Structure formats: C-alpha cells, structure tokens
Design a protein around this ligand. Structure first.
Ligand SMILES: Cc1cc2nc3c(=O)[nH]c(=O)nc-3n(C[C@H](O)[C@H](O)[C@H](O)COP(=O)(O)OP(=O)(O)OC[C@H]3O[C@@H](n4cnc5c(N)ncnc54)[C@H](O)[C@@H]3O)c2cc1C
Ligand SMILES: NC(=O)c1ccc[n+]([C@@H]2O[C@H](COP(=O)([O-])OP(=O)(O)OC[C@H]3O[C@@H](n4cnc5c(N)ncnc54)[C@H](OP(=O)(O)O)[C@@H]3O)[C@@H](O)[C@H]2O)c1
Length: 523
C-alpha cells in the first residue's frame, strides 16, 4: 500500500502520467471516479460532443508509433473516436492494471516528517505516496439548476453530463433543451434531425464558429503524418499549442479588404483559432469589434429569420472572451420548421409540471427535457478534494483569496504535490494533450532530479509564488479574457496568459537551473 506516485484521474493527463512515471522506474497507483479511462471523453458523451482543436494536434506526441499508426477519421474527432483512441492508448501501454476505477479520491494528507502523502478513497483505499499528482481535469459539471416541479414532470429528463450509453430516441418526441453553451450547441442540431419538435430555451446567446468538418482522406493523412515532427515543434513553441500564428500586422493596421480575407480564412479552418486571427484580437477592444462584426454578418446570412438571427446574437460581449464554441450546422438548425428559439429574458422558466415547461408567457408540452448543463469553475475538481498540507493547512484555505502557485506546479506548504494543467499554468488556454505532456514530463524530471540528489522533496517557496501570482496578474490585465464575469476568474484570473511556448521555456529553464524558486528538501 505504498507507491512512488499516486495519480488522481485517468483521462489524457493521468494516462500519460502512468506511462511516463513507470518508464522511469517509479511505481504508480492511479484512481479514477469513472468506470473506464478517458476522463471528459469517457463521461461527457451526449450526441455531437467534439473537440475544438484539430485532432492531429489534439493527440499525443510522446509515441512516434501511435502517431503513424492511428488514423483520425476527420478534422475534429467526436467523443466516441477520442474515447476509442484513449482506450487504445491504455491497451498499448498496459495502463489499466495500475488504475482502480469507480474509486473517488476524497483526501490527501501530508506527513511532514516523512514527506509522504496518505491518500484515501470512498472505496476504503488508504495508500502512501512520495509524490501526489492531481490530474483531475479543468472541467467538472455544474449542478443541475433547481427547477421547481421538475420532480413532477412525467416525460424523460436527460442530462448532457450523464448521457445514456445506449442513446436516446428523439423520434416522435417534443423536446426542450435548456442551456446554450457547448453541450447545447453541439447536441441541438442532432436533436433537431430526429425530433418531432424542438424548443431551445435560451437565456444568453454565445459565440459559435463552424467546425467545417471534412473526412480526412488517405493522401492527406500520409502527408500530414510525414511532416508530424515539424508540426509538433511549431506547436510546442506557439501561443496555443497548435502550428498556427496570428497575422504579422495588427487588425487595425491592415486594410478593410485584407481584414475580411484573414477572417474568412480562419472561419474555414474554424474553431478556437478564429479568436486569435489577429495579434491584438483579444487585446484591443476596437480590433475585437471588427471580429464581432464579421461574425454577426456570417450569422445574419445563414439565419433566414432576421429576428431569430438577432436573438442568436450575443449582446455587448467581446468575441472570444468566453471561449468560442465550435459547431456543426448549429445556426442552420434554426431555419427548420420544427425548431423554435425561446427567449428566456422575455419569458423565463418558472417551473415544470406533469406535461412540460412553464414560462411566464406560455406553457410548453414536452415529452423530453434535455438539461444542457455547463461546467463548474476551473478549480471544481480540486475543491471536492480535502488536501491537507503543512500545519494541517488545507488547499481550499490557501486558495481562499485566489489560487496561489509557482508556475502552477509549486505551492508553499504543499511539498511533493503537483496539480496538472490548472491555475498558474496556461491550462485551457492551450492544447491540453501537449500541455499534459509538458507537465507530466516536468514532474518526472523533477522526481529524477531529486532521486539523483538523494533528496526527499520539492516545494514552492512563498517568495516565488507571490512573484508568479503578480506575473499572472500582469499578463491578465491587458486581456479581454479578464472580463467582469469571466469563467477564467476566481479577483484572480487563473490561467497564465503569456503563451504556451513562453511558459514551456520559463518552466524548462527553472528546471535547468536547479529549480530556482523551489526548495529542495532532504527530509
Ligand atoms: C466538448 C469538449 C470539447 C473539448 N475540446 C477540447 C480541445 O479541442 N482541446 C483541448 O485542449 N481541450 C478540450 N476540452 C477540454 C478537456 O476538458 C481537456 O482537454 C481534457 O479534459 C484534459 O484531460 P485531463 O486528463 O486533464 O482531464 P479529464 O479529461 O477531466 O480527466 C480527469 C479525470 O479525473 C477524474 N477525477 C476527478 N477528480 C477525481 C477524484 N477525486 N478521484 C478520482 N478521480 C477523479 C475525472 O473523473 C476524470 O475522469 C474539451 C472539453 C469538452 C467538454
Ligand atoms: N474546449 C474547452 O476547453 C472548453 C469546453 C467547454 C467549456 N469550456 C470553458 O468552460 C466555461 C463554461 O462553459 P459552459 O459551456 O459550461 O458554460 P455556459 O456557456 O454558461 O453553458 C451553460 C448554459 O446553460 C444555461 N443555464 C444555466 N443555468 C440556467 C438556468 N437556471 N436557466 C436557464 N439556463 C441556464 C446558461 O445560460 P447563462 O449563460 O445565461 O447562465 C448557458 O447557456 C467556458 O467559459 C469555457 O472557458 C472550455
């Protein structure tokens, strides 16, 4: 019941963690709440669930064999394909034997003298670890909003977070969807394909850009696969972990014709990359406005009814402030005869009854209600974890006035503890597979550094975290991501905004210099 490393989570990050640590001779125990590997790709399985970043980028690079061997069927893989990929990865590297599934980590307590972590679970596991590595992911489900009389409704209630494995038939059914974030946006067009009638209950419109999905052919695949190494080098040095860069010139320093041409290009590629089309797009409000206009025109042209197009248009929000969603035929869905967009600002939901949804304005008879829930704060999974460090001081207490980290990898009072791809790191702002590889590699090197020195532990110094907190604050203040009610907030803007390449370089040089800003512990 003791191991070198305990890993929390078996999604992209935990799976690579198991592989990397084991390869270096460390014994590893992983714990996963879900019944299988995959993380978000295991449990978030509503129809239309799909990644934001091209699959060739949003995939592992640690294995040349896997890169050559695996064939992505399209530009943006759906979750069943990403799940299949991750299951294949766990097969190839024999990861499952070190994972205990259906097992939720509840507490981790530092033994200050021994420099070890006692990790406890809801299934009665109690294990001892030199290093505790939390790979619990950036996205956890929001609580189902309290609707009165929900318990009274007699039709089916389906949650996008807990989608039935064997699916749900919408044929013949009157369906209501509450929620227009990414879960609602991705499932809506698919729901509308087989539903008798679909009502979308929208409170706040969000920005969405087409995926523009193409099935990747043979001659395309082999040519991208032939140039994979170079694509990875460009990705690892870039702002967002993909082989793309913003325009050389600024948005306002270019002509109106050329501005449309750059925007038109990035619309085709589609996704998150549209947000970073010009260098100052997320920096300067006026440059942002030009992207908002381009977006509004595109949507006005796709949606037949002018008033619906207006209703689908987000009001006084910077485009790309909140993360832009990626869709497959979402706005085209509203041209159908069998879909209605309900403005909840006009007529809010006041409850449900036996037969459907009650708004202030009208009652809606429904056979099925789909709760397209959103995702909790970036720290949501960590907040379900009781982590007791030096002095019996909890992580939740340390983070009360905001997350405090050095590089996202060190916290004073929490030695030999590593939170992956969370606050103080680029996190959701970068390609997370590559980001996971970066963090897992960094942790492994740090462990190797300590083992070579005969040292017991490593810990963020108070001075270094304070410098980093302010460094994060400084990069954040110029950004339109630091919006009044931004999800990246907790006040403290949580992710590192400098860029992924910049951050890689910062943490690599820290390591190379004998871990400045960390204390090496003999313990
Ligand atoms: C529709 C959608 C599309 C996305 N597209 C992209 C994209 O294109 N690019 C991108 O970079 N990111 C994308 N993301 C973000 C995605 O969340 C991350 O890429 C991904 O989750 C990183 O994997 P992870 O292993 O860090 O975390 P996760 O996938 O969340 O895995 C963490 C695992 O830890 C488990 N866990 C948590 N707490 C505990 C505990 N206490 N005990 C035991 N187990 C625990 C969870 O059950 C989960 O299985 C997308 C997310 C969604 C929902
Ligand atoms: N690829 C990625 O990395 C990725 C993917 C998804 C999300 N994210 C991140 O996570 C954050 C949140 O994403 P999200 O899509 O979960 O949040 P979201 O965009 O707010 O989606 C939730 C939806 O449900 C609606 N809703 C919630 N409670 C309601 C109620 N009581 N009545 C009616 N409607 C209600 C919300 O409306 P209101 O807006 O009016 O509350 C919203 O439309 C984003 O900012 C993004 O940074 C990242």
């Amino acid at each position: 019941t003791s191991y070198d490393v305990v890993v929390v989570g078996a999604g992209i990050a935990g799976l690579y963690a198991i592989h990397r640590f084991r390869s270096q001779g460390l014994t590893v125990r992983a714990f996963e709440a879900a019944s299988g590997v995959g993380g978000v790709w295991y449990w978030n399985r509503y129809p239309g669930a799909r990644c934001d970043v091209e699959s060739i980028d949003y995939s592992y690079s640690f294995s040349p064999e896997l890169e050559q061997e695996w064939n992505w069927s399209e530009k943006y893989a759906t979750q069943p394909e990403i799940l299949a990929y991750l299951e294949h990865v766990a097969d190839r590297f024999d990861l499952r034997r070190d994972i205990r599934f259906d097992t939720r980590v509840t507490s981790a307590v530092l033994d200050e003298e021994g420099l070890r972590w006692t990790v406890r679970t809801d299934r009665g596991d109690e294990v001892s670890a030199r290093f505790l590595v939390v790979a619990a992911g950036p996205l956890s489900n929001a609580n189902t909003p309290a609707f009165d009389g929900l318990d009274r409704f007699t039709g089916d209630i389906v949650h996008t977070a807990r989608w039935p494995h064997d699916g749900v038939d919408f044929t013949g059914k009157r369906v209501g969807v509450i929620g227009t974030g990414s879960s609602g946006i991705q499932s809506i067009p698919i729901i509308a394909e087989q539903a008798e009638q679909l009502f979308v209950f929208q409170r706040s419109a969000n920005y969405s850009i087409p995926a523009g999905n193409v099935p990747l052919d043979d001659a395309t695949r082999a040519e991208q696969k032939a140039n994979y190494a170079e694509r990875r080098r460009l990705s690892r040095e870039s702002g967002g972990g993909s082989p793309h860069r913003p325009h050389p010139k600024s948005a306002l320093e270019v002509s109106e014709e050329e501005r449309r041409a750059v925007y038109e290009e990035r619309w085709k590629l589609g996704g998150v990359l549209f947000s970073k089309a010009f260098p100052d797009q997320l920096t300067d409000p006026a440059a942002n406005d030009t992207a908002r206009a381009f977006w509004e025109e595109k949507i006005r042209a796709v949606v037949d009814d002018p008033a619906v197009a207006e209703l689908l248009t987000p009001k006084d929000h910077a485009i790309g402030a909140k993360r832009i969603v990626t869709d497959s035929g979402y706005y085209e869905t509203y041209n159908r005869d069998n879909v209605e967009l309900v403005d909840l600002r006009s007529t809010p939901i006041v409850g449900m009854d036996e037969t459907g949804i009650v708004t202030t304005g009208a009652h809606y008879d429904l056979d099925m209600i789909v709760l397209a829930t959103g995702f909790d704060a970036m720290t949501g999974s960590l907040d379900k974890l009781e982590i007791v460090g030096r002095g019996g001081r909890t992580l939740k207490e340390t983070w009360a006035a905001g997350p405090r980290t050095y590089l996202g990898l060190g916290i004073d009072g929490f030695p030999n503890f590593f939170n992956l791809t969370g606050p103080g790191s680029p996190s959701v702002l970068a390609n997370m597979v590559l980001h996971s590889e970066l963090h897992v590699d960094w942790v492994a090197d740090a462990i190797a550094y300590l083992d070579a020195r005969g040292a017991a532990g490593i810990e963020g110094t108070p001075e270094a975290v304070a410098d980093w907190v302010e460094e994060c604050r400084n990069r954040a203040e110029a950004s339109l991501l630091n919006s009044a009610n931004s999800w990246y907030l907790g006040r403290v803007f949580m992710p590192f905004l400098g860029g992924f390449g910049v951050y890689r370089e910062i943490i690599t040089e820290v390591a190379e210099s004998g871990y400045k800003g960390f204390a090496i512990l003999e313990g």
